């Protein structure tokens, strides 16, 4: 059984550094990419970077250019994400996730296929794609959620995934590669794409569809970009 166990919550004063760990088990650590994302209540889903567990080669989001270092200890199969020069803006829940399967014949580092997620790590410092903020439907209706980027990200590649997040819970893999369903997900959820906009359609709206939905996509230059999120209300 796959488990991604992250290190515990931390409080840091500003200017300090944080080193978050992620220890995966129940699968071959070196077969899949490791991604790092973060989320604050007053913002959306922010992709931080990827790491190849085999070689240790990484890529980080532009906004983290030189304050993030991702590494791994091979003897203990543990990934690390270090964030330097903390401020209050860095207060967030940080997530370690799995990614694309690592193949010799192509690069899947930028596949936003986050099948499995760590439990999250709350950092407190004391001392993006465009989604509609809110979408509403009554029960039984078909609803649709947009996710707009540019011709450089979602406009190129059929590499868009969708994630469902209940309050105080970890995001869940719902749709990937635009229209593909992960095992366990009902056909009620479908995905499509047109030009620079990807869409998630939820048919037969049940009450328990009420949640936050996030789109992630190939971001350009082997990055991944995520949306600000969409709250779905069922009347």
């Amino acid at each position: 059984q796959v488990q991604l166990v992250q290190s515990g919550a931390q409080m840091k004063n500003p200017g300090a550094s944080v080193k978050v760990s992620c220890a995966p088990s129940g699968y071959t650590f070196t077969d899949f990419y490791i991604h790092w994302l973060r989320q604050a209540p007053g913002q959306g889903l922010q992709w931080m970077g990827w790491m190849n567990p085999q070689t240790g080669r990484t890529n980080t989001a532009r906004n983290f250019q030189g304050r993030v270092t991702m590494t791994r200890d091979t003897s203990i199969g543990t990934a690390y994400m270090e964030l330097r020069s903390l401020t209050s803006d860095d207060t967030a829940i940080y997530y370690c996730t799995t990614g694309g399967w690592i193949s010799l014949y192509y690069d899947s580092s930028y596949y936003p296929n986050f099948d499995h997620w760590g439990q999250g790590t709350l950092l407190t410092v004391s001392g993006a794609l465009t989604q509609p903020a809110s979408v509403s439907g009554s029960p039984g209706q078909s609803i649709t959620i947009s996710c707009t980027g540019t011709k450089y990200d979602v406009g190129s590649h059929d590499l868009v995934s969708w994630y469902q997040q209940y309050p105080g819970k970890v995001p869940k893999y719902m749709i990937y590669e635009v229209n593909k369903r992960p095992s366990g997900v009902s056909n009620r959820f479908s995905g499509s794409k047109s030009g620079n906009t990807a869409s998630l359609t939820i048919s037969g709206l049940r009450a328990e569809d009420e949640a936050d939905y996030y789109c992630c996509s190939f971001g350009g230059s082997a990055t991944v970009v995520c949306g600000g999120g969409t709250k779905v209300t069922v009347h």
Binding site: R57, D107, Y110, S221
Partner: peptide, 30 residues
């Protein structure tokens, strides 16, 4: 029929954008 690809995404000798892969070749014989 022989087809070889270089997955590496590079611009300038000192910069590769994504992850690293060797070149690979695939042959199809019918």
């Amino acid at each position: 029929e022989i087809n070889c690809t270089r997955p590496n995404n590079n611009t300038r000798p000192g910069e590769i954008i994504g992850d690293i892969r060797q070149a690979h070749c695939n042959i199809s014989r019918a």
